Design a protein around this ligand. Structure first.
Ligand SMILES: [Mg+2]
Ligand SMILES: [Mg+2]
Ligand SMILES: [Mg+2]
Ligand SMILES: [Mg+2]
Ligand SMILES: [Mg+2]
Ligand SMILES: [Mg+2]
Ligand SMILES: [Mg+2]
Ligand SMILES: [Mg+2]
Ligand SMILES: [Mg+2]
Ligand SMILES: [Mg+2]
Ligand SMILES: [Mg+2]
Ligand SMILES: [Mg+2]
Ligand SMILES: [Mg+2]
Ligand SMILES: [Mg+2]
Ligand SMILES: [Mg+2]
Ligand SMILES: [Mg+2]
Ligand SMILES: [Mg+2]
Ligand SMILES: [Mg+2]
Ligand SMILES: [Mg+2]
Ligand SMILES: [Mg+2]
Ligand SMILES: [Mg+2]
Ligand SMILES: [Mg+2]
Ligand SMILES: [Mg+2]
Ligand SMILES: [Mg+2]
Ligand SMILES: [Mg+2]
Ligand SMILES: [Mg+2]
Ligand SMILES: [Mg+2]
Ligand SMILES: [Mg+2]
Ligand SMILES: [Mg+2]
Ligand SMILES: [Mg+2]
Ligand SMILES: [Mg+2]
Ligand SMILES: [Mg+2]
Ligand SMILES: [Mg+2]
Ligand SMILES: [Mg+2]
Ligand SMILES: [Mg+2]
Ligand SMILES: [Mg+2]
Ligand SMILES: [Mg+2]
Ligand SMILES: [Mg+2]
Ligand SMILES: [Mg+2]
Ligand SMILES: [Mg+2]
Ligand SMILES: [Mg+2]
Ligand SMILES: [Mg+2]
Ligand SMILES: [Mg+2]
Ligand SMILES: [Mg+2]
Ligand SMILES: [Mg+2]
Ligand SMILES: [Mg+2]
Ligand SMILES: [Mg+2]
Ligand SMILES: [Mg+2]
Ligand SMILES: [Mg+2]
Ligand SMILES: [Mg+2]
Ligand SMILES: [Mg+2]
Ligand SMILES: [Mg+2]
Ligand SMILES: [Mg+2]
Ligand SMILES: [Mg+2]
Ligand SMILES: [Mg+2]
Ligand SMILES: [Mg+2]
Ligand SMILES: [Mg+2]
Ligand SMILES: [Mg+2]
Ligand SMILES: [Mg+2]
Ligand SMILES: [Mg+2]
Ligand SMILES: [Mg+2]
Ligand SMILES: [Mg+2]
Ligand SMILES: [Mg+2]
Ligand SMILES: [Mg+2]
Ligand SMILES: [Mg+2]
Ligand SMILES: [Mg+2]
Ligand SMILES: [Mg+2]
Ligand SMILES: [Mg+2]
Ligand SMILES: [Mg+2]
Ligand SMILES: [Mg+2]
Ligand SMILES: [Mg+2]
Ligand SMILES: [Mg+2]
Ligand SMILES: [Mg+2]
Ligand SMILES: [Mg+2]
Ligand SMILES: [Mg+2]
Ligand SMILES: [Mg+2]
Ligand SMILES: [Mg+2]
Ligand SMILES: [Mg+2]
Ligand SMILES: [Mg+2]
Ligand SMILES: [Mg+2]
Ligand SMILES: [Mg+2]
Ligand SMILES: [Mg+2]
Ligand SMILES: [Mg+2]
Ligand SMILES: [Mg+2]
Ligand SMILES: [Mg+2]
Ligand SMILES: [Mg+2]
Ligand SMILES: [Mg+2]
Ligand SMILES: [Mg+2]
Ligand SMILES: [Mg+2]
Ligand SMILES: [Mg+2]
Ligand SMILES: [Mg+2]
Ligand SMILES: [Mg+2]
Ligand SMILES: [Mg+2]
Ligand SMILES: [Mg+2]
Ligand SMILES: [Mg+2]
Ligand SMILES: [Mg+2]
Ligand SMILES: [Mg+2]
Ligand SMILES: [Mg+2]
Ligand SMILES: [Mg+2]
Ligand SMILES: [Mg+2]
Ligand SMILES: [Mg+2]
Ligand SMILES: [Mg+2]
Ligand SMILES: [Mg+2]
Ligand SMILES: [Mg+2]
Ligand SMILES: [Mg+2]
Ligand SMILES: [Mg+2]
Ligand SMILES: [Mg+2]
Ligand SMILES: [Mg+2]
Ligand SMILES: [Mg+2]
Ligand SMILES: [Mg+2]
Ligand SMILES: [Mg+2]
Ligand SMILES: [Mg+2]
Ligand SMILES: [Mg+2]
Ligand SMILES: [Mg+2]
Ligand SMILES: [Mg+2]
Ligand SMILES: [Mg+2]
Ligand SMILES: [Mg+2]
Ligand SMILES: [Mg+2]
Ligand SMILES: [Mg+2]
Ligand SMILES: [Mg+2]
Ligand SMILES: [Mg+2]
Ligand SMILES: [Mg+2]
Ligand SMILES: [Mg+2]
Ligand SMILES: [Mg+2]
Ligand SMILES: [Mg+2]
Ligand SMILES: [Mg+2]
Ligand SMILES: [Mg+2]
Ligand SMILES: [Mg+2]
Ligand SMILES: [Zn+2]
Lengths: 138, 124, 99, 83, 208, 99
RNA sequence: GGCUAAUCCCCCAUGUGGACCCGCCCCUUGGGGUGUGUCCAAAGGGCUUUGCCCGCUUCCGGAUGGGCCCGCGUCCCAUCAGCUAGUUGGUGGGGUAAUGGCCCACCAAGGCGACGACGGGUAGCCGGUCUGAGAGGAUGGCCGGCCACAGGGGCACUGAGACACGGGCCCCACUCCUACGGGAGGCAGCAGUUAGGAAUCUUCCGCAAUGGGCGCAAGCCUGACGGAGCGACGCCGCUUGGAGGAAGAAGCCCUUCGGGGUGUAAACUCCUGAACCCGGGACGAAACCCCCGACGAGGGGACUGACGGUACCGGGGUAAUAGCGCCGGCCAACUCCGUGCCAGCAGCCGCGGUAAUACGGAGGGCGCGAGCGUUACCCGGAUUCACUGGGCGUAAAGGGCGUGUAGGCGGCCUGGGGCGUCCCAUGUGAAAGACCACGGCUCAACCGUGGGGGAGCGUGGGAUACGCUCAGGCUAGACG
């Protein structure tokens, strides 16, 4: 099957961006949609789209990079420098409000899934909820 | 390993053996020379090394090394064992503490004297 | 707070005494993932109302025999015969792993 | 039976007492039921007596027994003062 | 029994001037007047690239020597300065400079650090009016450190004092040369003191 | 040597004695009364049961019994008697028994 | 064998009440209420002696201390895989303050285990301590809590309470008395002895304080306890001096024989004044008691200090112990002799076989200092058991391959519930300790007062994104 939907999302993005692709289809979910909404508003993807490929629902994820590097290796600086899953099917991670990490000196974020819904560490913290810690981004 | 492996079996704390049974956990143990003599060292080194097989309050009969420049020990001297070993000859897990029980201290030693157990000398 | 749990009835074989199988999850104090674990309670069925495969709330009660400290509370559920044939197969399995 | 007493607290030659409710059978310095004051016999500082009447009035009402040294301290604090 | 035995050797090892003698350390003697090399046989030798250890140990020793203090004392102080909230090096200087014996020196009642120690130990000083004899004693600000009334005619006191008339005193202190009384009013920042120690090296030394 | 308030032991015997031959007195009568129930003679039985109950409570006056081993023995007896009074008994005296 | 008193033991009455069987009322496991029968009380003593005090008796509460029971947590070995006959349950009964196979009689044939039963080994748990960035690891001496034991094993008695350390009984081992019949002990209370060991203290003072027993009180008892002693065992404070003092003495070391070094170090000069001597001298102690009032509230009065003529205060006063480890690299600190694979060092690399910064002594130096080394044991480094935080093509490491059991894991959409999860309130999280703040000993160690934090579990209330689960639906996986 696909054992983590989400991981595989994050990954698609990762190998996508590493190879500098202008964007990518990922197979569609209300949740995976939340996550990219957050991921987007928060600066990391150009934005995304709800597409249909071969009669099946996909989300296109458009993809942003920084400008052209000089010298040898002109490959431009990544925006999504790193993205990684935290909670994993059969090993879960749930955090108090006092336990919500904070990321790369605040230069990145966490994504939490709460009963206030999906939100960033900062958002949770001001909201005052905890939840499953989905992912590290920075 | 997976997680479900760590829950299933899970990691193994591993313990360490002792480099010595002075037993007791004792810091030192009293003994009696059974025999005393001189041995040849190991690998690159030549020497005549000074040592005494000693019988113990801990019940075992061991080989200990008599440190420093002269010594006084013979058939049944009685002596104290501290342990710490000698790499260059083998079977010696322990040193004799000089200056205790029937073992003298090394006399004339000016230089490092707590080890070797010699009293501080006076002058004018 | 007189403690009360839930379980399945895995045993008929005593007069007024049923055996109840009760599971609980809880996260692993170190490796941190939920573990599912379970325990068996002999419980007091005065009139032999509960039959096997039933799901029942179970309760803390003044003592009845050695082994018997809980009396049946109510009937929550009728005929989950799956949990039953489950535990029963585990048990049949003991018969390997032997001599 | 239940008693209000003193427990020794400061160091050697520097005693500070704890004014305290507890069963008689107890060790002197061992676990006690409520701390009701402190008393510093050598009067080292401005206030060497805390009592808090309110509460020692209670224990008395419910059958607490003060030791007399305790009683003196107590009543210095007018736990007993009647009107 | 904290260091008692030839000093101008230490002025020397540490390779920069220490004023452990007070006056004369201002003369053309401090021995670092022409013989600034380190002590011993091999002290006039071309010396060798310093280990990173050496550097930080020697920076410690330079501060410890300066203030006259035992290791155990020095460390226990530094530990105590870690613990406190605030920048650890600077606090440490605070705490040093707040030792009674040092205030007594820095108030000018004595020629030298050691001299103030003796001054103290022997009873010649009063803090807020009680005689206080231990050089450890920590001077709070607000505190007034002054010479003992019964001790006010001593030669040594007058020499020092009278010829402190007019010199300015450390800006975290006040002096009154009539009462032989002075106030420690604040705490020294690291540029209030001048010491030729980069303290952070000493932090670095205990980090190991 | 000679701890003098070992005297306590010395008493405990006299005391032990007393206690034993209260208990026993009681035990005997009780048995007898119960017996008379199964013989159906409820006149004689009730009379004896009555004396047993006096005695028990009276011996609960002291250290001997006290408590509720008062009640316990009382209850036990009176029931075993009444319950034993029908193989058809018409409970004659009813000194001790509640109509 | 014989007299004899009581708050000792009985018998009769009174029945506020309580106890028990039976019936009903309410209530929900044996909780209350009530009626009928039955059964159950008691002890005097003192005075300021006709009314007060210390006692007795039955009931109902409080309070404190406990029993018992449940969830959860709680070391190694699977080269321990099966275990179980009071075993597991049931009816009746014994017993007990009380539940229960705690025991007993007769029925049923069950209970338990790879979610590690049974066996073996080891160990008193905890508040906390040590270490660590943390996570973890390791530990449970002192102080508090809980348990167990009292030469080994059984047992009960008395009692509110024990199956009782200085109570009882029997067996056993040991010691001692013995007229050989038979008897007596029990320091794992404080001291002390002996033995064992590398090793662990005075047969001290005191009942002043605090605390406990009895006593109406006076008081008595108190090796609990307050104190003193001995050990650098630890921690903290302090001393063996401060300022001057040479272009820099002798001695000693090095020397390229010019000079370099110890070294302002000494000598010497001038201040100060540890030790010690004199004087004065505590706090810790104010109640019990006694007097007025009313034995209350309140007020007045009296006694009492082991530590101790100690702490502290004032006067006088002497320049007054320093040692131990290191100097080849890890690592701060170098030269000359001596020695010649010897003697020796050695934590590890390794040194020594005639120019040894590595052995041994010297001068010099580095580090700490009334201490400094050593051995032993824990944690660290060691991300070398890897949760944080490792790996498996050749380095150690993918099972020889397959089928599936237990188990782990689980696509897309909607609704229910709300177990996991998140939040809020609340109860618990004793004191000690740790953290912060002020404060008390001249400082500190040590001590007080206050404040803060807290995982975890109980309870009530709330959210529903993710996990579960139940209901529905879909087809991208799977199958046909
Ligand atoms: Mg939480
Ligand atoms: Mg791993
Ligand atoms: Mg060799
Ligand atoms: Mg001999
Ligand atoms: Mg070693
Ligand atoms: Mg010796
Ligand atoms: Mg050596
Ligand atoms: Mg059945
Ligand atoms: Mg039963
Ligand atoms: Mg029920
Ligand atoms: Mg089987
Ligand atoms: Mg007591
Ligand atoms: Mg108790
Ligand atoms: Mg007051
Ligand atoms: Mg800090
Ligand atoms: Mg300032
Ligand atoms: Mg300066
Ligand atoms: Mg600088
Ligand atoms: Mg560090
Ligand atoms: Mg008596
Ligand atoms: Mg008979
Ligand atoms: Mg007679
Ligand atoms: Mg009535
Ligand atoms: Mg009635
Ligand atoms: Mg009567
Ligand atoms: Mg009586
Ligand atoms: Mg009441
Ligand atoms: Mg109660
Ligand atoms: Mg209670
Ligand atoms: Mg209770
Ligand atoms: Mg049977
Ligand atoms: Mg049997
Ligand atoms: Mg029964
Ligand atoms: Mg069977
Ligand atoms: Mg289980
Ligand atoms: Mg253990
Ligand atoms: Mg054991
Ligand atoms: Mg810490
Ligand atoms: Mg680790
Ligand atoms: Mg920890
Ligand atoms: Mg433990
Ligand atoms: Mg002990
Ligand atoms: Mg203890
Ligand atoms: Mg308990
Ligand atoms: Mg025993
Ligand atoms: Mg016992
Ligand atoms: Mg013994
Ligand atoms: Mg026994
Ligand atoms: Mg009694
Ligand atoms: Mg009894
Ligand atoms: Mg009893
Ligand atoms: Mg006994
Ligand atoms: Mg004894
Ligand atoms: Mg006997
Ligand atoms: Mg002893
Ligand atoms: Mg011996
Ligand atoms: Mg002692
Ligand atoms: Mg005495
Ligand atoms: Mg007393
Ligand atoms: Mg008393
Ligand atoms: Mg009394
Ligand atoms: Mg009187
Ligand atoms: Mg006596
Ligand atoms: Mg004592
Ligand atoms: Mg000794
Ligand atoms: Mg010694
Ligand atoms: Mg010692
Ligand atoms: Mg010279
Ligand atoms: Mg010369
Ligand atoms: Mg000088
Ligand atoms: Mg002068
Ligand atoms: Mg003088
Ligand atoms: Mg006098
Ligand atoms: Mg006094
Ligand atoms: Mg006074
Ligand atoms: Mg009295
Ligand atoms: Mg008295
Ligand atoms: Mg009157
Ligand atoms: Mg009167
Ligand atoms: Mg009064
Ligand atoms: Mg008065
Ligand atoms: Mg005296
Ligand atoms: Mg005197
Ligand atoms: Mg004086
Ligand atoms: Mg003077
Ligand atoms: Mg001198
Ligand atoms: Mg001098
Ligand atoms: Mg080092
Ligand atoms: Mg070096
Ligand atoms: Mg030779
Ligand atoms: Mg030669
Ligand atoms: Mg050669
Ligand atoms: Mg040579
Ligand atoms: Mg050579
Ligand atoms: Mg050399
Ligand atoms: Mg070496
Ligand atoms: Mg050497
Ligand atoms: Mg030397
Ligand atoms: Mg010291
Ligand atoms: Mg040491
Ligand atoms: Mg290790
Ligand atoms: Mg680490
Ligand atoms: Mg590795
Ligand atoms: Mg792999
Ligand atoms: Mg190979
Ligand atoms: Mg291989
Ligand atoms: Mg393969
Ligand atoms: Mg293979
Ligand atoms: Mg396979
Ligand atoms: Mg398969
Ligand atoms: Mg399956
Ligand atoms: Mg799903
Ligand atoms: Mg839902
Ligand atoms: Mg939930
Ligand atoms: Mg709802
Ligand atoms: Mg509690
Ligand atoms: Mg606490
Ligand atoms: Mg904190
Ligand atoms: Mg203070
Ligand atoms: Mg403290
Ligand atoms: Mg608190
Ligand atoms: Mg709190
Ligand atoms: Mg904490
Ligand atoms: Mg905690
Ligand atoms: Mg809570
Ligand atoms: Mg909802
Ligand atoms: Mg599942
Ligand atoms: Mg479905
Ligand atoms: Zn100088």
């Amino acid at each position: 099957m696909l054992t983590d939907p989400i991981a595989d999302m994050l990954t698609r993005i990762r190998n996508a961006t590493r190879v500098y692709k202008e964007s990518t289809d990922v197979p569609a979910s209300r949740f995976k949609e939340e996550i990219l909404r957050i991921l987007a508003r928060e600066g990391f993807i150009k934005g995304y789209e709800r597409v249909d490929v071969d009669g099946k629902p996909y989300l296109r994820v458009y993809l942003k990079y920084g400008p052209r590097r000089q010298g040898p290796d002109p490959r431009p600086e990544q925006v999504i420098h790193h993205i990684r899953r935290i909670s994993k099917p059969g090993r879960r991670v749930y955090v108090g409000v006092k336990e919500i990490p904070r990321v790369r000196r605040g230069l990145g974020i966490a994504i939490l899934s709460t009963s206030k819904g999906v939100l960033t560490d900062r958002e949770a913290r001001k909201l005052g909820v905890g939840g499953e810690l989905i992912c590290e981004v920075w | 390993p997976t997680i479900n492996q760590l829950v299933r079996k899970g990691r193994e704390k591993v313990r360490k053996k002792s480099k010595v049974p002075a037993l007791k956990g004792a810091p030192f143990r009293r003994g009696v020379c059974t025999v005393v003599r001189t041995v040849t060292p190991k690998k690159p080194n030549s020497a005549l090394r000074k040592v005494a097989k000693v019988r113990l309050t801990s019940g075992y009969e061991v080989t200990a090394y008599i440190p420093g420049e002269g010594h006084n020990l013979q058939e049944h001297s009685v002596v104290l064992i501290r342990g710490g070993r000698v790499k260059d000859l083998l079977g010696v897990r322990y040193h004799i503490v000089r200056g205790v029980y029937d073992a003298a201290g090394v006399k004339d030693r000016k230089k490092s004297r707590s080890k070797y157990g010699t009293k501080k000398p006076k002058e004018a | 707070p007189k403690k009360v749990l839930t379980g399945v009835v895995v045993s008929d074989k005593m007069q007024k005494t049923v055996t109840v199988l009760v599971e609980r999850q809880f996260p692993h104090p170190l490796y941190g993932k939920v573990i599912k674990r379970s325990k068996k309670y002999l419980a007091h069925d005065p009139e032999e109302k509960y039959k096997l495969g039933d799901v029942v709330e179970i309760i803390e009660s003044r003592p009845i025999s050695k082994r018997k400290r809980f009396r049946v509370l109510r009937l929550v559920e009728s005929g989950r015969m799956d949990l039953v044939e489950k535990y029963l197969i585990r048990r049949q399995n003991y018969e390997s792993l032997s001599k | 039976m239940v008693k209000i007493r003193l427990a020794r607290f400061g160091s050697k030659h520097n005693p500070h007492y704890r004014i305290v409710v507890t069963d008689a059978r107890r060790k002197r310095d061992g676990k006690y039921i409520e701390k009701i004051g402190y008393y510093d016999p050598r009067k080292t500082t401005p206030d060497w007596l805390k009592v808090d009447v309110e509460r020692a009035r209670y224990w008395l009402s419910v059958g607490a027994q003060p030791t007399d040294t305790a009683r003196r301290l107590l009543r210095q604090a007018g736990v007993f003062r009647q009107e | 029994g904290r260091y008692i035995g030839p000093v101008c050797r230490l002025c020397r090892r540490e390779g920069v001037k220490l004023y452990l003698k007070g006056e004369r350390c201002y003369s053309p003697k401090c021995a670092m007047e022409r013989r600034p090399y380190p002590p011993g046989q091999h002290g006039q030798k071309r010396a060798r690239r310093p280990s990173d250890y050496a550097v930080r140990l020697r920076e410690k020793q330079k501060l410890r020597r300066i203030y006259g203090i035992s290791e155990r004392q020095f460390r226990n102080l530094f530990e105590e300065a870690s613990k406190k909230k605030g920048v650890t090096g600077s606090v440490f200087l605070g705490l040093l400079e707040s030792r009674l014996d040092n205030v007594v020196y820095r108030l000018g009642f004595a020629v030298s650090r050691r001299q103030a120690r003796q001054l103290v130990r022997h009873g010649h000083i009063t803090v807020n009016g009680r005689r206080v004899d231990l050089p450890s004693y920590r001077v709070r600000p607000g505190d007034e450190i002054a010479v003992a009334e019964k001790s006010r005619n001593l030669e040594l006191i007058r020499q020092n004092l009278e010829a402190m008339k007019g010199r300015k005193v450390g800006p975290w202190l006040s002096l009154d040369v009539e009462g032989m009384k002075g106030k420690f009013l604040r705490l020294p920042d690291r540029e209030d003191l001048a010491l030729p120690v980069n303290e952070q090296l000493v932090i670095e030394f205990y980090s190991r | 040597r000679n701890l003098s308030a070992l005297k306590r032991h010395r008493q405990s015997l006299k005391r032990r004695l007393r206690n034993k031959a209260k208990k026993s007195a009681i035990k005997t009568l009780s048995k007898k009364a119960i017996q008379l129930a199964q013989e159906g003679k409820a006149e004689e039985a009730l009379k004896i049961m009555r004396k047993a109950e006096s005695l028990i409570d009276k011996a609960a006056k002291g250290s001997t019994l006290h408590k509720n081993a008062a009640a316990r023995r009382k209850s036990r007896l009176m029931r075993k008697v009444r319950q034993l009074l029908e193989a058809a008994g018409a409970p004659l005296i009813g000194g001790g028994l509640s109509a």
